[PDB]
Fold this sequence. Notes:
Layout: E1 21-22, E2 25-29, H1 31-40, E3 53-54, E4 56-58, H2 63-71, E5 80-84, H3 87-91, H4 96-112, E6 116-120, H5 132-148, E7 154-155, H6 192-204
Parallel strand pairs: 2-4, 2-5, 5-6, 6-7
Antiparallel strand pairs: 1-2, 3-4
Amino acid sequence: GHTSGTYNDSLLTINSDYDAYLLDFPLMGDDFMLYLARMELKCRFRRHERVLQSGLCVSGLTINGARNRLKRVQLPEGTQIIVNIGSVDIMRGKPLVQIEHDFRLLIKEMHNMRLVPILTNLAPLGNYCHDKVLCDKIYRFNKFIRSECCHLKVIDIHSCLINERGVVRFDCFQASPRQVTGSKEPYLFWNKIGRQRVLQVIETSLEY
């Protein structure tokens, strides 16, 4: 097409000095992991992009967005990437079947690129706690991650943010939702306690 291959060349290269990384693993995800990395992992935002991002963490990144983003990145074979992806698809109201279809293709594409996914499942969306349909989607998609990625490392971060009765721990979330750059839906971010719980679940799952 007329505009094919006209993107910022700087997007092809990521670097742990400035981009979102956790223990030498690149992080791929949306605003949730972007914010985790900004607050806990000293990441910097890319200065030339309108939409906030740091490495493979991009505001508004859907599963398809991630599929595209990896085509615009170049990393050594065998690179392991920690992935948290799907919240944006769910917030935008993409059909679950489509979400699962896209995720299966993301996994296959990473395999074809010789990039190894380390999966995290989805945290509860705290401001959507009254939307039973959305919460059911999170429940089913998380089960899908676990079954589809049966040969890969799958980290359950969802559990650390819900209580004994399966309802969201609001003491792990901020008080009010926020506008983000890559999506029109409001986000309720993990607070200091919430961020540390998620970070510790991920690290302790990868220690040995």
